[PDB]
Amino acid sequence: FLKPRLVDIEQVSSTHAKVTLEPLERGFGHTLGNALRRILLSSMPGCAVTEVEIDGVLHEYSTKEGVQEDILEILLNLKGLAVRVQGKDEVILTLNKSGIGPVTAADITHDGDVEIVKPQHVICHLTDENASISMRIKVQRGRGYVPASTRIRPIGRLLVDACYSPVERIAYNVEAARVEQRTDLDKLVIEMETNGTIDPEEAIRRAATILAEQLEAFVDLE
Amino acid sequence: VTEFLKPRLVDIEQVSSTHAKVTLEPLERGFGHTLGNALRRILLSSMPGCAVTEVEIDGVLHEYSTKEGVQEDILEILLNLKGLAVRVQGKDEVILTLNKSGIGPVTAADITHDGDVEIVKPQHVICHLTDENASISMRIKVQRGRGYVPASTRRLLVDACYSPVERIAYNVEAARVEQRTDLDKLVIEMETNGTIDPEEAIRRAATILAEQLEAFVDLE
Amino acid sequence: EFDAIKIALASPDMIRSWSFGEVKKPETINYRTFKPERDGLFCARIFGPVKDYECLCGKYKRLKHRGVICEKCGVEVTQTKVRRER
Amino acid sequence: EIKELLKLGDLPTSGQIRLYDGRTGEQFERPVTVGYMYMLKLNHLVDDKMHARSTGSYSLVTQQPLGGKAQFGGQRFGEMEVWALEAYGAAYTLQEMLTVKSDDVNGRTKMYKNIVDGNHQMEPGMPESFNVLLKEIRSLGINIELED
Amino acid sequence: QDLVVTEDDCGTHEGIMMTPVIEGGDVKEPLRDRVLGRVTAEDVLKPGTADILVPRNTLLHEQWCDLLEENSVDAVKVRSVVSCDTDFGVCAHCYGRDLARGHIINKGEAIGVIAAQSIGEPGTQLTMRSSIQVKNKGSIKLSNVKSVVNSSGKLVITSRNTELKLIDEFGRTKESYKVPYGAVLAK
Amino acid sequence: REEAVVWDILDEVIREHPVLLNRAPTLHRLGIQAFEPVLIEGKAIQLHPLVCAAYNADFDGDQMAVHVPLTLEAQLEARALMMSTNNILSPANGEPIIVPSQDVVLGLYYMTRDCVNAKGEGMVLTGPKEAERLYRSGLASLHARVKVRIT
Amino acid sequence: RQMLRKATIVNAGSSDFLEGEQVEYSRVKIANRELEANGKVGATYSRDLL
Amino acid sequence: ARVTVQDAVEKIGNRFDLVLVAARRARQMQVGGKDPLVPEENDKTTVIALREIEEGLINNQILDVRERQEQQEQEAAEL
Amino acid sequence: KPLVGTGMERAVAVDSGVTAVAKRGGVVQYVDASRIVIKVNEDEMYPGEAGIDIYNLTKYTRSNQNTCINQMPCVSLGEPVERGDVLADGPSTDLGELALGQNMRVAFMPWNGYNFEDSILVSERVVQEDRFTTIHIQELACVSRDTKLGPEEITADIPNVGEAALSKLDESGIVYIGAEVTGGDILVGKVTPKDSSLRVPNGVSGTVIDVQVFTRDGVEKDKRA
Amino acid sequence: MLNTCYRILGLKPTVIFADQIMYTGFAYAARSGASVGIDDMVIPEKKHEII
Amino acid sequence: PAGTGYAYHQDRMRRR
RNA sequence: AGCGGAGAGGUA
Ligand SMILES: [Mg+2]
Ligand SMILES: [Zn+2]
Ligand SMILES: [Zn+2]
């Protein structure tokens, strides 16, 4: 059989892209299509938020004098806040900002491994001429969906739900290619959609690594 | 983060040698279909195997025909050819023949041996003849191929069923591990054409798909 | 244990055989202490023990005195369930 | 006007997009409706209806399980399905439905001991509530007894 | 409420007579639904008449009902619970099939309660609030006739209670009608 | 405490222990039927669909109760009589009460149908196994008329 | 069958019932059926429909 | 395993005394100190009991034989 | 908001008292999660009685069917509002529209029996977005009855409980504002002279958000009161 | 079909037969994809004239 | 006295 | 151990 390779990464935008595979025998386009789609949505490494500890907040259902939104809406906003970390498997992030204006992610203290992928992402609107929020944001690695109920202690450490997945939408469309003098060969076009924290070559490589491990469950390595 | 509940097969429970039923547990949630479908499409559509493609008949040049001394028909006799179980040496294709006369079921025992062409069922009925003056004579050609091809996409022309398999069904169900929530217990059920065991028939499809990710392995 | 059920009119002799006292006073509860009265509708000395194996006066707080009635307020110490059928 | 509005978008005039299974990965024949329906959650949540009871409190005038959930009480095994048990041949099922599991306090002490020891056997005794009825009719001007 | 299948046989020969109902048009409940699964009162006298098709106590399962069907059996007397001579109960050979078990009823399963639930359950699905023109071609049988032929030759009947049956080609009834007092028949 | 040992104990004791489900308008005698439990991550009873037609119970929010036979005679009365495999024919009539109600008959009436012109018209196949091999391949139509061999 | 279980008497004969009395058909059928055990004539019943 | 009690009825034509024979037997296997007369699958006493009814080696008659015969063991040990 | 609305939604949201409608039109002076302060326009302004319109929103508190009546502001600082327009998006209101549930991508096909009679299959994307996750409030009570053998007490002296039950209280026997409790934990340690602490009802979870204590006149006030 | 299966083969193959009906029924009702749409209901054009 | 209990009242009525 | 009656709304 002829064997597929990474022929191209088409970074069509900063968020998402299209990888392309070539060639494939007939039938394998849908096989690696459904396979790699289902794996890329299944189990990729992620960097979601887990715990946010706001200064003057005992419980997550109160106000905070100086910011128009609730504590809880800050928790959903940070629940959608996406980050890339490399050298660790967890990290603590610090936020400090005062004065009237939006609290964007740029005011979070960035480290040598902390990388906010989208600094444009709003968090909350401060509204007072002299007031501030000051929170610590615990971010760890993980995999899949983990709700805050099924995990595993002071009253200040809040809890939110974990959304450990980078991927947003996986799409693929099989088609023929310009293979030299040969027909019935297949150009695989994958269109993945990502929040931005996973490179696509690493994405499809970790995916096929995992599915090769699951076939490796009953055949040896070659 | 990467540690996965790797399964291994808990039994190969089986009816007789052309059929078995393989179970797998405990797969991660979602992985049950992505192997039960993937191993389905590879086995059902892409397996290297040998079957019969073209046959010409001694005094019959048309599909809508008959022959005297033959209880069955010629449109019927092609179906008996599709159930033939042939293993061929590294040649691509070769012709065989069957020549015989007499009353009775001319079976697959009356095929010429032709060396490496080995049949798993000499008991296999090809057709019935009912006269002593009724003689059978035909030229049967085997061929090696990579998946099912019908005749309309393709002298009598046969549906090329090169695949050794005949039925595969994954049946994804739940399985529990002491505190984990829900996991896929994957149950394959599978019949072959007798040219191969049901065991290593899976192990070719595992071999094919593992070679399909060879640019993507990342060393482990 | 038993077969058929028969039913009939009530003789006053059968009524007095059933009973264990003429209830005389309409007040039931003291509601100051939670004891009931001498011979009210809730009556300890006609119907039996309020709590488990204790007299209402509280004389025989031991299981050893089981069966004998008291003299201080005359309550037959038995199970409290005996206040259910009398 | 909805067709014209769909014609303003790219989405087809038929309204029905073809879809692909996530398991097979191949096309559902005869294309299907998708869209955005405006849906509601109602407050009949399951954890305000899911309830169970092994053995909890017993009622006072009848030694029977309490009623409801806020009082940790059993279910009412009502009359019509007593008729339905009569419709089957199930007698011992019924005889433990309304004697052991329900009314007689001695029999369910014996039952509780026998389950925790590992015997499955019932000792009927008598329904308490029937004896209450006997003291009620007897508490009118009615002599009612039991024979030998 | 009270009614337990408690004996095996009454050992009698009463019963009722099942005929398929004909409301006045087509047959609307055929014979092989009303008869099906009930024990005969006496034997089936086939219309090869003095031929005994089934015996006098046999449960009529589907084979025997097909043999009744081919020989066109008209009226079948059958053991019913209403005429069962059981004391304090119902015998087995007057009830027949359980209808959930493909054999005779066992001794005990109280058909009173399964009867009353099975009657009253579809009540949730109920509702709450010239001449004679014959249809098909067969022979005409009259029931309890007192008639006279008029001056023109048409028949008129001096009895109210005369019933107009259209027998088929074989011998069963397939239409039934009321003919009033002094009605001008055509045939 | 909910230890991880007592889930194994419960998986022992509910190996063959039938339960008696009831639905509140218990009209005819099929209203209580016995089943065997299979334990579920969740909080709602899962219930076999055919039995819905006996229970007169759609899934619009119907609530069903469970009872447990304690004594051994009651378990034998449950499994011998009130097990759902026994009740297949109504006491009202000899008809099946295990009627496939609404989706499954749509799957059949879509399955066993025939259009005149689609993939694989009039071809010949050695049995049903090549038929399902055709349909899972996507090489023949689901409903196109074919001569096959059957036994 | 449960409707017409009760009955009345046309003539008591050698039994013990009052003539214009209502009693269930089973008890009177075993009543004269055991008066059939002697040569005496029992009752002539009459069924009712309640 | 257990799906039906059909063939148990096919050897005991009552379908009710199935329950009493089975309750007598499984009661003799839970409380009494007797092994099953069939290889078990770590089943309960119930399916073992009805499963022994499937092979026909127990009905009401054999149970009469064992109550009478073990009863005479309770006579012969009494001396 | 619903997509396929009916035009009544603005009127329904205004008419019920779930929102806060600016009774005089003006410009935002100040907006916060607690209050909204509006400078009044000068032509709607009274001559005397100088004033600015000061609105107190209702934060998380109990409904009468145990749901979450809540008011969120929808405006930024420095913004012109018109007389007769809402300010606080109340419960189930979206920018003054009437927003009961949420709208979703939905497809009509039978899928493997899992929508058999009227059932609904739902993707895990829904529960990932937390877009039907709701809030309930259960007001629990525990009192101090003047009874036999003296009154029953409130303080943290509790007989024969685990130390986790002791740790989740204060020094006075009342759980703090914010302690995430499961079922069976002790909320208020009430002892009976002879142990009847108010405990969380069976199997539920949640979070204490608000403690109230009323006391009869003439009785001692302890430290947390 | 089910009734003749019980009248001929007895109880056990009728039961497990009915299960296999149900599983394949949702497999092919699922794979079939019988939806419903506003284009699916067809007005007859001759309605207006009979009106 | 319906099913299994009808066997039981066969016993009990059989004794008296 | 501490749970009876009204009245109101809803659930299939
Ligand atoms: Mg409903
Ligand atoms: Zn005293
Ligand atoms: Zn009879």
* Structural contact between residues E40 and E76, judged by C-beta atoms closer than 8 angstroms: yes
**Does B39 share its domain with B70?**
no
d(CA B106, CA B113) in angstroms, rounded, equals 15
d(CA E147, CA E165) in angstroms, rounded, equals 16
d(CA A45, CA A206) in angstroms, rounded, equals 9
> What are the distances in angstroms from CA A130 to CA B162, B204, E109, E142, E174?
79, 71, 85, 111, 100
* Structural contact between residues E27 and E173, judged by C-beta atoms closer than 8 angstroms: no
| Experimental technique | cryo-EM
From J32, E11, B1, select the one nearest A85 (Cα to Cα): B1
From B4, B8, B49, select the one nearest B28 (Cα to Cα): B4
d(CA J7, CA J30) in angstroms, rounded, equals 31
> What are the distances in angstroms from CA E97 to CA A116, B142, E94, H30?
78, 61, 10, 37
> b/e for B169-198, b at 16 or more Cβ within 10 A?
ebebebbbeeeeeebbbbbbbbbbbbbbbb
Q: How many residues does chain C have?
A: 86
**Does B185 share its domain with B197?**
yes
What phi and psi, each to the nearest 5 degrees, are found at residue I207? -145, 130
d(CA I156, CA I190) in angstroms, rounded, equals 8
Q: Are strands I186-188 and E5-7 parallel, antiparallel or unpaired?
A: unpaired
CB contact under 8 A, E82 and G1: yes
* Structural contact between residues C77 and C54, judged by C-beta atoms closer than 8 angstroms: yes
Ligand that lies nearest to the alpha carbon of residue C54, given by its number in the listed order: 2
Protein CA I133 to sugar C1' L6 (Å): 38
**Torsion G18-G24-G30-G33 (CA) sign:** positive
Residue type at B108 in one-letter notation: A
Residues near C17 by Cβ (< 8 Å), separated by ≥ 6?
Answer: none
The number of beta carbons lying within 10 Å of the beta carbon of residue B210 is 18
From E162, E166, E164, select the one nearest E137 (Cα to Cα): E166
Distance E53 CA to ligand 3 centre (A): 22
- What is the DSSP annotation of chain B? -------EEEEEE-SSTTEEEEEEEEEPTTHHHHHHTHHHHHHHH---EEEEEEEEESS--SSS---TTBSS-HHHHHHHHHT--EE--SSSEEEEE--EESSEEEEGGGS---TT-EES-TT-EEEEE--SS-EE-EEEEEEEESS-B-TTT--EE--B---SEEEEEE--EEE--TT---EEEEEEEEEE-SSS-HHHHHHHHHHHHHHHTTTS-TT-
d(CA B189, CA G39) in angstroms, rounded, equals 79
J46 touches chain E (CB under 8 A): no
**Does A6 share its domain with A89?**
no
D47 touches chain C (CB under 8 A): no
d(CA F63, CA F26) in angstroms, rounded, equals 12
Residue nearest to nucleotide L12 (CA to C1'): F62
Whether the link from the prior residue into F37 is cis, omega within 30° of 0, is no
Instruction: Kindly identify which residue of chain J lies nearest to residue E63, measuring between CA atoms.
Output: J7
Residues near I46 by Cβ (< 8 Å), separated by ≥ 6?
Answer: none
Q: What is the largest CA-CA distance in chain K?
A: 20
Q: H/E element holding D23?
A: none
Residue type at C6 in one-letter notation: K
**Torsion D61-D67-D72-D74 (CA) sign:** positive
DSSP letter at D100 equals I
Q: What is the CA radius of gyration of chain E?
A: 21
**Does B116 share its domain with B65?**
yes
Residue F7's Cβ-count burial label (10 Å; 0-12, 13-18, 19+) is middle
Residues near B139 by Cβ (< 8 Å), separated by ≥ 6?
Answer: B55, B56, B57, B95, B96, B97
**Does A116 share its domain with A50?**
yes
End position of a domain, from candidates A164, A179, A213:
A164
H21 token code pair: 């024979």
I141 token code pair: 């009570």
> b/e for B97-112, b at 16 or more Cβ within 10 A?
bbebeeeebbbbeebe
The number of beta carbons lying within 10 Å of the beta carbon of residue H59 is 17
Helix axes J2-9, J12-32, angle to 10 degrees: 150
> b/e for I100-134, b at 16 or more Cβ within 10 A?
eebbbeebbbbbbbebbeeeeeeeeeeeebeeeee
d(CA E111, CA E118) in angstroms, rounded, equals 10
Ligand that lies nearest to the alpha carbon of residue F64, given by its number in the listed order: 1
Residue H79 in any domain: the answer is: no
I112 touches chain J (CB under 8 A): yes
Residues near I157 by Cβ (< 8 Å), separated by ≥ 6?
Answer: I173, I189, I191
**Torsion B146-B150-B153-B155 (CA) sign:** positive
Rounded-to-10 torsion of CA C8, C13, C17, C20? 120
How many CB pairs below 8 Å do chains F and I form together?
A: 21
Output the domain CATH number for residue H5. Answer: 3.90.940.10
* Structural contact between residues I106 and I125, judged by C-beta atoms closer than 8 angstroms: no
Chains that touch E (3 or more CB pairs under 8 A): D, F, G, H, J, K
Residues near E59 by Cβ (< 8 Å), separated by ≥ 6?
Answer: E37, E38, E39, E96, E97, E104
d(CA F122, CA F147) in angstroms, rounded, equals 6
D26 touches chain J (CB under 8 A): no
* Structural contact between residues B168 and B39, judged by C-beta atoms closer than 8 angstroms: yes
**Does A87 share its domain with A185?**
no
- What is the DSSP annotation of chain F? ---TTHHHHHHHHTSS--EEEEESS--SGGGEEEE-----SSSS----HHHHHHHT--SSS--EEEE---SHHHHHHIIIIIBTTT--B-SS-SSBS----SHHHHHHHHHS--BSSSTTTT-EESSHHHHHHHHHHTSS-SSB--EE---
Residues near A4 by Cβ (< 8 Å), separated by ≥ 6?
Answer: A21, A22, A23, A24, A28, A32, A188, B212, B215
> What are the distances in angstroms from CA D89 to CA A101, D85, H18, J35?
77, 7, 12, 46
**Does B73 share its domain with B98?**
yes
Strand L: positions under 7 A of a protein C-beta atom: 1-4, 11-12
Residue H10 in any domain: the answer is: yes
Chains A and I touch (3+ CB pairs under 8 A): yes
Q: Distance between alpha carbon A84 and the CA centroid of its chain, in Å?
A: 8
Which spans in G1-50 are helix H? 25-35
Domain span including residue A134: 46-164
C20 token code pair: 């264990």
Helix axes A200-215, A28-42, angle to 10 degrees: 100
Output the domain CATH number for residue A40. Answer: 3.30.1360.10
> What are the distances in angstroms from CA A98 to CA A57, A77, A122?
17, 18, 15
Distance E4 CA to ligand 3 centre (A): 13
Domain span including residue H29: 1-74
Whether the link from the prior residue into C36 is cis, omega within 30° of 0, is no
d(CA I88, CA A70) in angstroms, rounded, equals 13
- Which residues on H lie below 8 Å from D115 (Cβ)? none
F130 token code pair: 């090549």
Task: Give strand letter and number of the nucleotide nearest F23 (CA to C1').
Answer: L12
**Does B65 share its domain with B119?**
yes
Protein CA D50 to sugar C1' L5 (Å): 27
Instruction: Kindly identify which residue of chain I lies nearest to residue J34, measuring between CA atoms.
Output: I109
Query: What CATH class is the domain E130-187?
Result: mainly beta
Q: Are strands E139-143 and E163-167 parallel, antiparallel or unpaired?
A: antiparallel
d(CA I209, CA J6) in angstroms, rounded, equals 62
- Which of I106, I138, I205 is the mutation pick for testing D, counting most D CBs within 10 A? I106
d(CA A206, CA B217) in angstroms, rounded, equals 8
Q: H/E element holding D58?
A: none
> What are the distances in angstroms from CA A62 to CA A68, A71, B50?
12, 6, 73
Q: Is H15 left (phi over 0), alpha (psi -120 to 50) or beta?
A: left
Residues near C79 by Cβ (< 8 Å), separated by ≥ 6?
Answer: C48, C49, C52, C53
d(CA C60, CA F28) in angstroms, rounded, equals 57
J30 token code pair: 């699922």
**Does A57 share its domain with A34?**
no
DSSP letter at E104 equals B
The number of beta carbons lying within 10 Å of the beta carbon of residue A195 is 21
* First-to-last C-alpha distance (Å) of chain K: 15
**Does A52 share its domain with A150?**
yes
SS (HEC) of chain C: CCCCEEEEECCHHHHHHHCCCCCCCCCCECCCCCCECCCCCCCHHHHCCCCCCCCCCCCCCCHHHCCCECCCCCCECCCHHHHCCC
**Torsion C61-C65-C69-C72 (CA) sign:** negative
Residues near F17 by Cβ (< 8 Å), separated by ≥ 6?
Answer: F36, F37, F68, F75, H44
Task: Give strand letter and number of the nucleotide nearest D68 (CA to C1').
Answer: L3
Q: Distance between alpha carbon C33 and the CA centroid of its chain, in Å?
A: 19
Please state the residue numbers annotated as binding site of E.
Answer: 10, 84, 91, 94
**Does A7 share its domain with A79?**
no
The number of beta carbons lying within 10 Å of the beta carbon of residue I183 is 12
Degrees to nearest 5, angle at CA E178 with E172 and E179: 115
The number of beta carbons lying within 10 Å of the beta carbon of residue I35 is 14
* Structural contact between residues D81 and D97, judged by C-beta atoms closer than 8 angstroms: no
Distance C76 CA to ligand 2 centre (A): 9
From A16, A66, A3, A14, select the one nearest A169 (Cα to Cα): A16
Q: What is the CA radius of gyration of chain A?
A: 22
What protein residues sit with their CB closer than 7 Å to strand L? Answer: D 44, 57-61, 66, 70-71; F 24-25, 57-58, 60-63; I 196
- What is the DSSP annotation of A93-126? EEEEEESSEEEEGGGB---SS-EES-TT-EEEEE
What phi and psi, each to the nearest 5 degrees, are found at residue E47? -80, 45
Task: Give strand letter and number of the nucleotide nearest F25 (CA to C1').
Answer: L12
d(CA B28, CA A9) in angstroms, rounded, equals 30
- Which residues on I lie below 8 Å from A161 (Cβ)? 130
Residue F33 pairs with which residues in a beta bridge?
F21
SS (HEC) of I102-137: EEEEEECCCCCCCCCCCCCCCCHHHHHHCCCCCCEC
Degrees to nearest 5, angle at CA D75 with D74 and D79: 135
In the block, residue with structure tokens 């529990």: B176
Q: Are strands E5-7 and E90-91 parallel, antiparallel or unpaired?
A: parallel
Question: In this structure, which long-range contacts are made by residues B201-205, counting pairs with CB atoms below 8 Å and at least 24 apart in sequence?
Answer: B201/B43, B201/B47, B201/B164, B201/B165, B202/A218, B202/B22, B202/B39, B202/B43, B203/A218, B203/A219, B204/B47, B204/B48, B205/B39, B205/B42, B205/B43, B205/B47
B43 token code pair: 């086995």
DSSP letter at H62 equals H
A28 token code pair: 């394998």
- Measured in angstroms, the CA of B201 and the nearest CA of chain A are apart by 12
> What are the distances in angstroms from CA E54 to CA E39, E43, I132, K16?
11, 6, 69, 42
Residue F125 pairs with which residues in a beta bridge?
F148
d(CA E138, CA E166) in angstroms, rounded, equals 6
**Does A4 share its domain with A99?**
no
Output the domain CATH number for residue B77. Answer: 2.170.120.12
Ligand that lies nearest to the alpha carbon of residue C73, given by its number in the listed order: 2
**Torsion E39-E43-E46-E51 (CA) sign:** positive
I220 token code pair: 């001692």
Q: Distance between alpha carbon F45 and the CA centroid of its chain, in Å?
A: 14
- Which residues on A lie below 8 Å from I60 (Cβ)? 61-62
From D145, H35, D109, select the one nearest C2 (Cα to Cα): D145
H43 token code pair: 């089943």
Task: Give strand letter and number of the nucleotide nearest D58 (CA to C1').
Answer: L1
Q: Distance between alpha carbon I7 and the CA centroid of its chain, in Å?
A: 29
Residue F41's Cβ-count burial label (10 Å; 0-12, 13-18, 19+) is exposed
Q: Number of folded domains in chain H? A: 1
Q: Is B30 left (phi over 0), alpha (psi -120 to 50) or beta?
A: left
Chains I and G touch (3+ CB pairs under 8 A): no
For residue A171, give the 3-state DSSP assignment: strand
d(CA K5, CA K13) in angstroms, rounded, equals 12
Beta strands (DSSP E) in chain E are 5-7, 16-18, 21-22, 27-29, 45-46, 51-52, 76-78, 90-91, 139-143, 147-149, 155-157, 163-167, 173-178
* Structural contact between residues B9 and B22, judged by C-beta atoms closer than 8 angstroms: yes
Q: Number of folded domains in chain B? A: 2
> What are the distances in angstroms from CA G44 to CA D25, E84, F61, G8, G36?
84, 19, 60, 9, 13
Distance C74 CA to ligand 2 centre (A): 5
CA atoms within 13 A on the CB side of F142: 17
Residue A197's Cβ-count burial label (10 Å; 0-12, 13-18, 19+) is buried
Q: Are strands G44-47 and G6-11 parallel, antiparallel or unpaired?
A: antiparallel
d(CA B92, CA B141) in angstroms, rounded, equals 11
F46 touches chain D (CB under 8 A): no
- Which residues on J lie below 8 Å from D33 (Cβ)? 35-37
Distance E98 CA to ligand 3 centre (A): 16
H16 touches chain K (CB under 8 A): yes
CB contact under 8 A, D90 and K8: no
B19 token code pair: 């059929």
Residue J15's Cβ-count burial label (10 Å; 0-12, 13-18, 19+) is buried
A133 token code pair: 């929020």
DSSP letter at D28 equals P
d(CA A186, CA A209) in angstroms, rounded, equals 22
Ligand that lies nearest to the alpha carbon of residue E6, given by its number in the listed order: 3
Residues of J with CB under 8 A from a CB of I: 22, 26-27, 29-30, 33-36
* Structural contact between residues I59 and I209, judged by C-beta atoms closer than 8 angstroms: no
For residue H49, give the 3-state DSSP assignment: helix
- What is the DSSP annotation of chain I? --SS--S-HHHHHHHSTTSEE-SS-EEEEEE-SSEEEEEEPSSSS-SSS---EEEE---SEE-SSSBEE--EE---SS-EE-TT-EEEE-TTEETTEE--SEEEEEE----TTTTSSS-----HHHHHHTSS---B---------EETTEE-B-SS--SS--HHHHHTS-SSSB--TT-EE-TT-EEE--B------EEPPTT--EE---------TTSPP-S--
CB contact under 8 A, F29 and E124: no
CB contact under 8 A, F4 and B78: no
- Which of H5, H15, H18 is the mutation pick for testing E, counting most E CBs within 10 A? H15
- Which of F47, F86, F111 is the mutation pick for testing J, counting most J CBs within 10 A? F111
Q: H/E element holding A167?
A: strand A167-176
